[PDB]
Every structure is written in structure tokens, then in C-alpha cells.
Symmetry: D3
Subunit: 236 residues, 6 copies
Amino acid sequence: HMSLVTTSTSDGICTVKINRPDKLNAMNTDVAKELIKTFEELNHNDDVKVIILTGEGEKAFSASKISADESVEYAKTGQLVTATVELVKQPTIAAVNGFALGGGCELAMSCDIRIAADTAKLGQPEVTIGVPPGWGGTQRLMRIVGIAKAKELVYTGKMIKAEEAKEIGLVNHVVPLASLQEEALKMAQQIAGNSTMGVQMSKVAINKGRNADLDTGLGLEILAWRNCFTHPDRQE
Amino acid sequence: HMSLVTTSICTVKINRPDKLNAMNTDVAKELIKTFEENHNDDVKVIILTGEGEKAFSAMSKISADESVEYAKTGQLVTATVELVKQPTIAAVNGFALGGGCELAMSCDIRIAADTAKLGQPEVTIGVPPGWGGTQRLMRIVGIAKAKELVYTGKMIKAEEAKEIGLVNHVVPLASLQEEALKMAQQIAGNSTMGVQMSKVAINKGRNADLDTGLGLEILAWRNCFTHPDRQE
Amino acid sequence: HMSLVTTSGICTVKINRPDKLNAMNTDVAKELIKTFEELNHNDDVKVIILTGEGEKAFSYMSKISADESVEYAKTGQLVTATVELVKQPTIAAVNGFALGGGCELAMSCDIRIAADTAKLGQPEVTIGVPPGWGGTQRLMRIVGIAKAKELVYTGKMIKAEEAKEIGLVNHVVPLASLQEEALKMAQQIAGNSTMGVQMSKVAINKGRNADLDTGLGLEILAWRNCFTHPDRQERMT
Amino acid sequence: HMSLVTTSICTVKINRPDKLNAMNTDVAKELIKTFEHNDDVKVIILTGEGEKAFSAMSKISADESVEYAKTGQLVTATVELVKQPTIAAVNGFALGGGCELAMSCDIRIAADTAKLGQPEVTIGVPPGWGGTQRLMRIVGIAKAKELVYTGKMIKAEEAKEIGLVNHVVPLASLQEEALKMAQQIAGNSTMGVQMSKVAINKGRNADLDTGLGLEILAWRNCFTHPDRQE
Amino acid sequence: HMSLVTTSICTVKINRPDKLNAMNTDVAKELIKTFENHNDDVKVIILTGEGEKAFSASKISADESVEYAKTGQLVTATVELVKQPTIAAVNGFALGGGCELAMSCDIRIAADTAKLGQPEVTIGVPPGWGGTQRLMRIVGIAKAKELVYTGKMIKAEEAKEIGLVNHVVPLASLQEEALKMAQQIAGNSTMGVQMSKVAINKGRNADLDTGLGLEILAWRNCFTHPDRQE
Amino acid sequence: HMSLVTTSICTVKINRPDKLNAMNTDVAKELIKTFEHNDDVKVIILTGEGEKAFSASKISADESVEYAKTGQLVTATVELVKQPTIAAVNGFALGGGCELAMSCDIRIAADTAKLGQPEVTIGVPPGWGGTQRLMRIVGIAKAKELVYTGKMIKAEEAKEIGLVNHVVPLASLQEEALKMAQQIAGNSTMGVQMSKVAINKGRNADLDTGLGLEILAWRNCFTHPDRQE
């Protein structure tokens, strides 16, 4: 179904793995709901400080004859899992180990930081079926890579390698697969070394001010800044 | 002023070659009429390029009052090219300067020739970009490069245009059209309803917060799921 | 304190405190506010160059309450907004270290040209706080949410080359060639229409915060304003 | 399908009182072309022909629905973003598109006989000409939700109560009042009025700081006009 | 902590009458999961306080105060964004979290004995379940600032004049009225009703053009439904 | 010049009664300086001196920009000040004064008060935030009516459209103001001004972003002694 295992310094680095390698870690509603409950619906426990999310099998991160009314609930489940991943307390590092197409790519775009392997191919092929990307791909892909590249990808519904994904910023870095998880830990243990209060107030400020004008975002930032100043992490 | 060829995809061309396909009021009105305020259901993808293979597109001495009208005509034609039903592929065959560049920035995807040169030199004569440059260039390449290009008013070549994201790809001149064709056809084979509703969703959610954009997307997604292209 | 040198209408502003690596306290912030506020009324100056004194750096009193924390953050927001919304375009010549409030200061300018020795970053979280002078917003609005999140969460420094790769700076030139380079671009902006330049700046800084239609309204208003100016009819010759 | 009378102030009247000036496609196009403006007109009054109706077949494709809702959006936007102000003199029924058309105008002055509403939901659709947004932006979210979910008529007194209309006067004296407000606006500066309209119509969609940028740009533009110094 | 009764329309009632139906986290969870998603048999939801005396009338860990506020946000959003229209029948006291919950609903009909307010600032905190935003979005910034800064209570008449409630009726006949409006919404097309709800709840947060895009999408989406022809 | 008197609540007064407390550049500058606040003051009262008025064509376009910037600066300084502000409209509030009144949080007007935006009768729009603040306070329809007509309105219809919070007899206006200022001053200072920050920021954003602002201010207040005591 889904795996979790935690160790780091303080050992609060939690690797979360999608466990369906027989079907290329494809995401159905069961995987979405289990992801929602693993990310605990907009919070977490206090042991974990950084989350590294990937899919087992070393081949794919994650790669409808239905009831037009039921597709609204389907897209709602997708939106809910993407928001639960996107707004979790700790930072998330998406280790894209191979294919990330459709929902999978959307999942990858819900995370804060993406470290892809030189074997990773991303895309949104929903438009080849007759549907748009229904789990936030029409919005998050734009907000990450620019309207031009997002439009190109969604219109063509094509697949792009991790190198051009790094070129357009869809992934933060590209490393060899053999080193992928290694790098995924190396960044995480770096974020875990910093103050959790500062890191996660920064995350709240960023995730809230991405949707507002500069003045409102600065208000969010100053409020989070005072909040962190009321914390012992600042003085020690 | 106009050129239309539709075979599959409708290539539209600005037919003013002896003036580097310059933008004016008549050309803007012709483009407005050509983009049909939507399109006909036969066309799936549109390619906008310039005649002569020397310039994509490279009367202002008057009356700020009707300068408002000139800017309104520019905004109208840029929004008609931007919000047209079919996707738009801009094949900049050289000079895309000022109103041309802004025009090129109205389309969804820009494919550049190696000889292409883009920029907003309005700041050198008397004015800011008045046909959407100050907003569209920012929304395409980011505020830093937008400010650099607008303040300096300089021209940049195609390679640095793809470096900052103003154009999606750069290909040799002699193979630009072809390449455009291919991409258009790669978009033409996809679902009409899917592509066009995703275009609606993107063009609407670019201006709103993530939640409102997700609402737009779920509405477009249901609308497509009520269409036969989804199941077949 | 702070040094000013103007000629061409090109004004170079220098943070003058090399003993503390041009560190940002409330004094230098207030002096920056006062210098950029005067330049708003200075009609000779056309372009502003912001850089640090010396060849090393462009630019922790926190024993304090949370209310004086709010006041410190407000002073930082004020200096960043005054630099950002100044009349003339600004060129931040990052001649070395730009970390913390210094990097946010550089991010408040219109254009950044960094030396090949420059290192930029937001190490705020390494001492328990987020960026307090607009980093969490301006960094994301300049380089995108992905790289902004990476840099803010790690709190690491990055060389000028990767800063140019992610858009944190516009260009990267050798250190000894930085100053000259900056002035060159400033010259290229100084020769343009001041009316058009500054209405462009107003339109951009206002439309970055709104939908496309409101930004187009701002643009058409600035366009008519410029069309009421003699620069328009006089240079379109 | 439409009448113009410029006497000074242009009164605009939709002309189909046979079934109370309903909003077809053709009157939408006629209103679009009529709202184009010229320098003569300073204020616009838009009312319905028939003395008791301002403006009061569909199982065809969803794509035609999209494009005719786009036509409605276009006519409402053309009415909403004119140079001069618009005074909607609601003489009677304003339901569905009509009321949406009335909500596109700057100011509404209704007769005491006027009943407004959005009954689209009694047919199986939402208001597709801007009601779901303009009604909410005029009367607030609570009253807008109430009116769109009920789809009922309300009397002009309740419209003035919830802000859907600015003022309520007797029908026989509606036009005199609308033209009174018109000539009050036309006596003011054309540049100031029209730049105020641009600033309001653009800043309603933005944060306060952006809107203040809009306002300062329009303010500078008004200071370049001869109407200021005199 | 809360009960449900459906017939034709579903009434949801906070069942804590001796505690004046006050809200803690557990009743919030019960309401969260009682608004599920939903089933297709319910058309209009009426939420009121059990006991016809009050609709609905913190010493650790600011860290856990964040989670308390997140639970409040979750319950308010689940009530607000839910499929069917919601009618808040405030039967008396609606203070603090209770009034915020009432403001999450679509339409509010108050008994003449109702008293609403946000007294959070008398404790040392702002409204933490959406008051600072929803009150301002319902009644406007001036009255919202007044009520939040004073923390005072207001009767049904003043809350109606400021738009905090849509209508005010006698207490002994509140629910009946709350029923009839519900009935009035039940007879309307569920597809049109709920697509209008989605369009409004999404376009209240965006500019006019984005809201019009949402509206035209929902308009075609109601043209997808068979209830348009019948 | 202007004056200030602190008693607990600092009453701030525009001291130009022989000119109906009209606004110039010097008045705006001294108002910016007065609104700076100090930790003792909990509520601010802004009114005009004299019981007659709260506050009632040579420049180029560039100094017109500068004048509009000064007006925006003073209106934003009053609007975003720490403590809640009560504008006691003791008569005329026209033009900038009107806009000044619209910058405060709460407006209590005397029955003889008259509010308006007459800029459009001179050739210009409101340039101190009227075209935005009036629409955000009273709605778009009444703001359009008032700005296009440029007409003065009495206190009661100003209350009807929401331009003022309450209408009080002139002879008692101040006292009523003080009374409200007392009721607000007794509440939590930290909670009330964090509420003010949340409101002034979330008025410009969508619901989700505003709720983020609110939850941040709420957590901030939970770290203050006022919450538990």
C-alpha cells in the first residue's frame, strides 16, 4: 500500500514510499486516500522534521469510464491529496525515481523541492485521453515552470526527460539514480539541521504569499517572523 | 494584411512584407476579424508567423486621448489572439519588436528561428509597451528580465530569448515552419475538448490564487467528462 | 554611513561600513531610506547604482522582544520598499557577499548584476527565524517557488553563476569588470526616455500584484500619461 | 431593436416591448455597437421601452451555450466599461439577463414598480451573463446567494434596501430623476468623471495598493487636461 | 453532540443544549464528518441550535492553538464549501466560534431574540475560526472592524441592517420560515443551484474576469444536465 | 499645526479651524509625524477642532504625482497605525478630509456632519485614496454615485450607505467617541491590534490567504500573557 520509515539527525527524516511497483506505482483513489492519511491531513507528528517522498521499485515515481458526476469526486480526491502533500508541516523533497506522468507528476509538483534522477521522465498526458490534468496540473505546473512551458506540456501531452525538466525548473536538481536517495537524504539532513520553527514558518509564509500581492505576503512574513521570535529557537 | 491557409491547422500570416510586417491599426483590426472575436470548428491549432521570412513583426505623434484608443486596439487584438479557442503557435521568423513582440507574447507557445530578435524598444522613443508588454513579458520571463528588457529597450537574440523563456524553442531558420507544423500537429492529434478546456483553465487560473484556479480546473474537467472524446 | 556620487544623472549609492562586511543594522537601513527618498525628488538622477563599499561584500542584535522584532521587520520592509519603489531604476551591483538582509536589499532593486565572486543567500533559518525583510516573498517572485523554497529551507549560500542560472541575478561578470558593466547598462537606461522608463517601472511594480486586466489598465494609464509628455513627440523623430 | 436620443445626455432604450424587452442575441449585438463613444455624450441613461419592463427554446448544444454566454459577457462588459457613466433607469421588470444588463451599468435608479431577480435556477442553469459575480459584487455574498438560490422576484424597495438599486422613485417621475442625476454628472468634469470610472472599474479587482497605483495614474492624467487648471 | 433529521431537506442541530450548544473540537469533528462529499437525496441543509435558546454560544501551547485554529478552519470550510445550500437558523446566541460557523453558511435567518458577536478580543485573542475574514466579507470592513475591536454583541435587528443575517423573524416561527425558504430552494434545479454555489464561492476570491470564466464553465456544466430541457 | 491629548486614548486634532481644518502638505506631514505609536496609547481618536469641520491649480503633473503620494502616505500611515482609530466627524468631511476619515477603522459622525468627494467638480478624481477606499467601505454602486456626482451627503444617509458607523448628536459626539474608545481600550491590546493587522491584510487577498494571516496572528496572540490571564 504505502511505506514510511524515519531516521536522520534527531532522526526525524521520514522517507515515504508509494508501494505499487507492479503497476508502476500508479495512483488510484486508494493510494490517494492512504497518502492523505499518511500526511495526516494538514499536520504531522513532532519527531519528523523533513519528508522525502518517492515510489518504490526504482522505476517510476508514480505513473475513468465514469459518471461525469463522479469525476468531480475523483478530482476532489486528487485536489485533497495534492493539498495534503503541499501544505504539510515539514518540508517535502520529491525524489522522482523514473516516470512521473499525470497524477504522479502532479504529486511531484505538490512537494516543496524535487530531486529527480537522470532516468526521470515527467509529463501530463491527460489531454491525450480527452480530459485536462484534473489534480492541479493546470495550475501548479504553471506556477512552477511558467505559463509558456506549462501550456506546451499540457497541450502536447508529451513526456520530457529530467534534463529539460531541470532546464525549465520542474525539478530542482538532477543526479544519477544510484545517488538519488543519497542526495535526497543529504538535502533533507541539511534542512533538518536548521530550526524547524523557522523552516516551517517560512513554509507557511511562502505557501500563503504565493497567492497574494506583495503587501499581503509581507504581512504574512512579518507575522510568522514575530511568531518565530516568540520561540526559543531564535535565542539559542 | 492577411494570409490564411488551413489544411491538416490554419497558418495565419501578417501580409506586409515590404514593411517588415509592421503592426498598425489596420493590421490589428484584420487580425481581430481573423481570430473571430473563437474560430470555426474545423481548425484545431493556429500558427501565427510573418511573411518574407525576415521579420515576424517589427503612426504615433498625436493626441493622448486617441493614444488611449490605439492602446485599446492593441489590447483588443492581443486578447483576441490570446483567448482564441484553438492553441496558438508563434513562429517568430526574425524581428518581433514592440507591438510585434507583444503580439508574439499573446500566443500560447513561441517557436523561434535562430535569426530571431525580440525586444520592446518603446522606451527609446516616448512610451512604455502599450500593447500588453509591461504585463505579458513579466508574466512570461519574470520581473527581473522584464524590467531589464523594458528599461534598456534593447534587442536580444533567439538563444538568450530561449534562455529567459520568452520563446519555448529555437530551431534553424530553414526548418522553423516545419518544426512549428510538427508541434501543431502533435497538438492537433490530441483531444479538441481537452486541449481547449485546459487552455481556458490555464488562461483563467493564471490570474487567481491556487484555490480559485483549482475550481476553474475542476469545472473544465467535469465539462470535458461530459464530452464523448473522454470515453472514446 | 552611506556615500553618494552622481554624474553621467547616474547616481551610485554605496553602503559604507566595511568593518562589519557592510552589515545591515537599523542605522544603515534608515540612511538608505533617507538617501532613496531624496532621489525621488532628485530630477537630475536618471539611474541608481546600489553596491557595497570595497571589493569584498555588497552587504545579530536579537536579544530582543517580539514587539521590537516586529519593529525591526517593519524597518526592513520600509527600506526594501523605498529602494524598490524609488522613481529611478535601480541596478544592484553585488560585489561579493549578499546574505540575509543584504540579499533582500539586492532583491528590492530592479536589476541585479553580480560579480563572479558574489555569493547570495538567506541564512536566516540557521539562527531560528525566517527572512524578515521580504525574502520569503521577493525571492519567490524573482526566482520561482521551487528555488525559493530550496534556498530558504536550506539557508545556504550560492555562487553568482547558479544565481544567474535561477534568475537571482540578471548577469554575472568578473569582479574587476563589475562596476564598469553596471554603469554601462545604467548609461543604456539613462539615454532612454525618463518619462517612459519610470512609467514602465510604475506599471510593472503595480501589475506584478494583480490580474492581467488590472495590469493592462495600469499600463494604458501610464501610456496615456507618457503620451501627454514632450519626450514622446520629441524623440519619435 | 434599440433607440438612441441624445438631447442635452444620451437616453438608450431597448426596443422589444411585445414581450417586455427580453435579451436575445440581436439586441445584445445592437447594444454592443451602440455602446461602441462620441465626445458629445457625457452621461448615458439606459431604460426599457414599454413603461413597465426594463428588460425581462433552449435545449440546444452546450457549445452554442458557451458562445452565447460569451456574447452576454461581451454585451455586459461593453455596457460596464464605457467612457461615460451609465444610469440604469429600471422601469419595471428586470429578471435574468436584463437585470444582469442592469447590474453592468454604473448607477441604477429604479421605479417603484420595478422587480428584479435571477430566475435562471428555476430553468436548470446559473445566471450566465455575469449575475453570479456582479450581483455578489453589488449586494454582497449573502444577498446574492439568497437571490440566486431562490431565483425569486424582489420589489424595488427591497432592492434599495440591499443596495441592488441606488434610489427608488415613482415610475411616472423616474425619467426626470434619472436625467436629474445625469445632468448633475454632466455638469462635472468629463476627464475627472471618466478617469474616476476607469480607476474604480479597475481597482475593484485589485488589492488596495494596486488600486492606489491606478488612482495616482488617473490623477496625473487628469492634471494634464485643461479641465483641471480652469 | 449533533443530530440529523431529513425529510421533504436535512436539518443538522448542535446537540449540546445545556452548554448553550457551545463548540469545542469534538463537535467540530462531528460537524466535519456530518458534512461528509455528500449523498444525492439531500437538497438543502438547515443548521440550527438545539433548544431554541442558542445557535452556538484554551490555556496551552500556541503550537496546539495552531491546531485548534486549523480544526476551526476545517469545520468552517467544510460547512461553507459543501454541496447543498446551507441555511443558518440562529435561534438566539451566536458568539465567537458559533457566529463564525453561522457565517460559514450561505444564508442566515435570525430569530428576533438572536444575538451575534465576536468577543474573542476580551480574552486575548482574535477570532480564530475565520471571523476576521468572513465577517468582513459578509458585512464590510467598517462594521467588521467595529464588532471585532469592541467584541460586543448585537441583536437580530442590527445584525440584519448590517447584513450579518439575511432576515429576522419571531423566534417561535423561526424554523418554519427557515423551512419554507429551504422548500423554495428545493423546488429549484439542484444542478443550477449547486453550480451557482460553486461559482460564487470561487469567484468571491478572484477578479471579475476570472469569476466570469468560472461562471461560464459552470454554465456549460449545467447545460450538461438533463434538467435544462425539463 | 495639529494637537494631541492622551487620557485613559489619545485624541488627535487637526488644528486649523479658521480654514475649516482643510488639508495641505504641511498638515499631512505633521499628521504623518504624529501617527509616527507609543506603548501607552491603546485607541486613537481623530477629529477636527472647532465643532465646525473634521476637515474640509498651479502645480505641474509631476508635483501632482508628489501631492498624491503625500496624500496616499498620510492615509496609509493613519490606516495602518498600531491602535484602532475612531474618526469623530464633527461636521464637514470633503475631499482629502473625507479620504482621511475613510482611512480610520471606525467613523462616528455628528448629526451635522456632511461627507463628500467634490474632486470631480474641479477636473480631477479623488487623489488621496477615495476611488478605492470609498468603494471598499460603501460598495461600488454608492461609491460610483458619490464620485461621479461629487455631491455632499448628510450624516444619516452616510450611515445608511455605511460611510459612517453611527450618527450621534454633535454636542455629544466626542463623548460617544470616547465611550467607544474606552470599550475598545478595555479589551486585549495584543488581540485587538493583531485583529487589526489580520483585517487590514486579508481585505486585499482571497479567503485562504486571509485565513493564513488570521491563524498567524492567532498563534502570535497565544504567546502573549493577555491570552491566558
